[PDB]
Amino acid sequence: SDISEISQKLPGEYFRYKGVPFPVGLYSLESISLAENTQDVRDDDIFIITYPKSGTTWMIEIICLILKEGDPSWIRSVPIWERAPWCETIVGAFSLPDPRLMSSHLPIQIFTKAFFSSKAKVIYMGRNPRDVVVSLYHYSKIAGQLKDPGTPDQFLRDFLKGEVQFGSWFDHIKGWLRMKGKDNFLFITYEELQQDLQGSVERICGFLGRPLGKEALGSVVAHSTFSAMKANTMSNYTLLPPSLLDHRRGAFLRKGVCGDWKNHFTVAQSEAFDRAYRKQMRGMPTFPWDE
Ligand SMILES: Nc1ncnc2c1ncn2[C@@H]1O[C@H](COP(=O)(O)O)[C@@H](OP(=O)(O)O)[C@H]1O
Ligand SMILES: C[C@]12CC[C@H](O)CC1=CC[C@@H]1[C@@H]2CC[C@]2(C)C(=O)CC[C@@H]12
Ligand code: NA
């Protein structure tokens, strides 16, 4: 009823915090400021950081299963957004009572500053920016906090100019990779999980210091699969208020594959995009999505 009243009042617009665009209604100068400056960062805290639409949900479910050592009970009975609350959202983990698992879309220059001097763990996940553009385009049409994308072509110019929620994808990931090297930082991609979920899971277990038996492992893998996840009412967001997410028009877990961009980018849009990528990612290393 509280979340319901809020959802129906969403303008579908943006406001800015230190130069970055944030959706109006689900974020505030204060909700963000709090996450940025809070001192409450713990040694065993766990953060999942991503640029929107990179497969956050997938990562969140994977760790919820790892923490419960494969027992689906927790993900079947508790809402996904409650198991790994968002830091910057008006109703965030920092504006709630009590291993803490948290989620965030904040770019490194705004993320909880007290982190850099802590032992908390951060898993950063990246996805092919092209597939992110698609996922985000569709999701915008059904997400109450987001403005309509407009034409695929205009939405792409907005994306390339960082004129979208959370700013530039380029800046976002370039900034966060600056942590690559600290032992309490893990960088993994949506593409790696797609190519070998089990391998990725074991990897993430090593990183977290939480080994699993061929048993629990198999369970985490089974329940993390797209098909399984889209069927879990607590994980597929079908419980959210229609205004916040138009279930009548689409699903949060849309397709769940790599390369859908190829059915959405025209060759002209693809070429323009590559020039923008080529210029912004000049010094960067090679990623799975770099063919
Ligand atoms: N278990 C899973 N397997 C594959 N894709 C998954 C997934 N869980 C979530 N996703 C995909 O991740 C995207 C949502 O990202 P986020 O959680 O960061 O908002 C969606 O992409 P698509 O729109 O391409 O289908 C969604 O289907
Ligand atoms: C939009 C967002 C925040 C951004 C995520 O990538 C997707 C998401 C899922 C559920 C939303 C949450 C914002 C905070 C909300 C509104 C809650 O308090 C419950 C449902 C939550
Ligand atoms: Na919308």
UniProtKB/Swiss-Prot annotation:
Gene name for this UniProt entry: SULT2B1
Disulphide bonds in the chain: none
Region of the whole protein represented: 19 to 311 of 365
Active site: 105 (proton acceptor)
UniProt-recorded name of the protein: Sulfotransferase 2B1
EC numbers, comma separated: 2.8.2.2
GO cellular component: a single term: nucleus
Entry keyword annotation includes Metal-binding: no
EC main group: transferase
Provenance organism: Homo sapiens (Human)
